[PDB]
UniProtKB/Swiss-Prot annotation:
pH-activity note: Optimum pH is 4.5-5.5 for the polymerization reaction.
Species per Swiss-Prot/TrEMBL record: Thermoplasma acidophilum (strain ATCC 25905 / DSM 1728 / JCM 9062 / NBRC 15155 / AMRC-C165)
Protein's UniProt name: Archaeal actin homolog
Family (UniProt): Belongs to the thermophilic archaeal actin family.
Keyword Heme in record: no
Amino acid sequence: MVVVGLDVGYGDTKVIGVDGKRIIFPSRWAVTETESWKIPVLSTDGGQTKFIYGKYASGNNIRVPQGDGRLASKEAFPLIAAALWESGIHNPVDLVIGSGTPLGTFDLEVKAAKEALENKVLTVTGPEGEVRQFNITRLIMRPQGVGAALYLLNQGIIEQQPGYGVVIDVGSRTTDVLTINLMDMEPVVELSFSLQIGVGDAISALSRKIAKETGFVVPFDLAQEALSHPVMFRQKQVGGPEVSGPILEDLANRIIENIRLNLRGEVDRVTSLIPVGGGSNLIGDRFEEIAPGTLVKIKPEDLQFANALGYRDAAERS
């Protein structure tokens, strides 16, 4: 009855709610033993266990997903609860959730997700002891990358034709490459794959470089900032584009080389190259060299949300 799009990324969790409102928050949570409920405290078991999530999850013992689209995992469950809480959708609300997961283990993760989530009543307790209840009636799933391609098609940004779309999703830990046949919008399994490299490799490389030069061990979140602009750490300015530039080009070069090897001659069928994910803000333009003239640049208002918008579209059309 209420349809929502949900995308639980390794990095960030995105929600498409009612009337096109969007939510995004960091895929992070931490258990709290406070008796308390700006900083919401939630529980899915009536207070036996409580947690804080998003930008407030702090300290030690922060929990994060093992990867993108791991909706059946223990690490994902508090984030799913938090997503539904943040949506503000309220009543026991009957939901259809449109979501997705990487193609390589699509059938396995879809089966697990349905078992974990479908026909379950989720009861979330929050501030002031308020309870919100959600009846998950149906979970509709599409491969990561297909969500984005379907959204772009619906928006008129790409068009069905002979040839392939290649969606390159640069995340923190992995790069998910989904090749789609534009004749029917179906994935080409032989040309779709997951590279174990992402922005975190650039962040680690910049951290090592800072440490080698200054002795400082910069926190991860600060090093990520230092990719785009110089930062202060222990009363010294470190990083920024002069330093991050060559490391980011190296990341791009490795992805491009691996895509070329995997696509081989089929690159000649590529008519649209579609960089998505957080990493594409940093290096997306570089992917044009795989197939000059085919680059589709997603509006910034949409890069982090493109899959979630497609997932929601697919559930609606159910």
